[PDB]
Amino acid sequence: PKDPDDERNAFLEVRAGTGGDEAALFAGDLFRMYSRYAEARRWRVEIMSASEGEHGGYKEIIAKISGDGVYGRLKFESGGHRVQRVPATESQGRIHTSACTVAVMPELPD
C-alpha cells in the first residue's frame, strides 16, 4: 500500500469535445459543477486561462485548485464525459449528444 498522493492538491483542465457549441456550453456546465465544490465547501480556485465559447461557456479552461482533497475527492476522473441533452442551440426541438475531456494535473516540484 504505497503512494504519496492518496489525497493531494491538483490543477484541473477542461476542453471542448464534440457538440461544438454544446461543447463549450456543456464544458461551462461542468465548470459550475466543480466551481460549486469550491466556496460552497472551502476551496480557492482561480481560472489559469480559458478560451471563450461563442454561444456560451468556454472551450478551453483550466483551474488552479486550493484545499486538500483534490486527490481524494477529484483524482478519479481524468477522461471523457459524454452528455445527451436537448441543447439550447437547436433549430427545431430534437435531442443531441455531446462530450468533453478533463485532466487532473497533480503537483510537480516547484
Partner: protein, 55 residues
C-alpha cells in the same frame, strides 16, 4: 473511454468504470458530486487492498 455519461432530457448519470448507473443528475449537476465520488473511492478495496490480501 467515456468516464461518465449524463442525460438531462432523461435525468441520469452513468460512470462507465464501476457499474454506477445510479443517478440523480439534477442536484449533482448543481455540483453536489459527493454522491458518485464515494463509491468510486470505495472501488479501491477490490482494487488495491485486494491486491495486498493474498495476490
Amino acid at each position: 473511454d467515456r468516464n461518465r455519461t449524463y442525460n438531462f432530457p432523461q435525468g441520469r448519470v452513468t460512470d462507465h468504470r464501476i457499474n454506477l448507473t445510479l443517478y440523480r443528475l439534477d442536484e449533482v449537476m448543481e455540483g453536489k458530486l459527493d454522491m458518485l465520488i464515494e463509491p468510486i473511492i470505495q472501488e479501491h478495496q477490490a482494487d488495491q487492498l485486494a491486491a495486498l490480501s493474498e495476490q
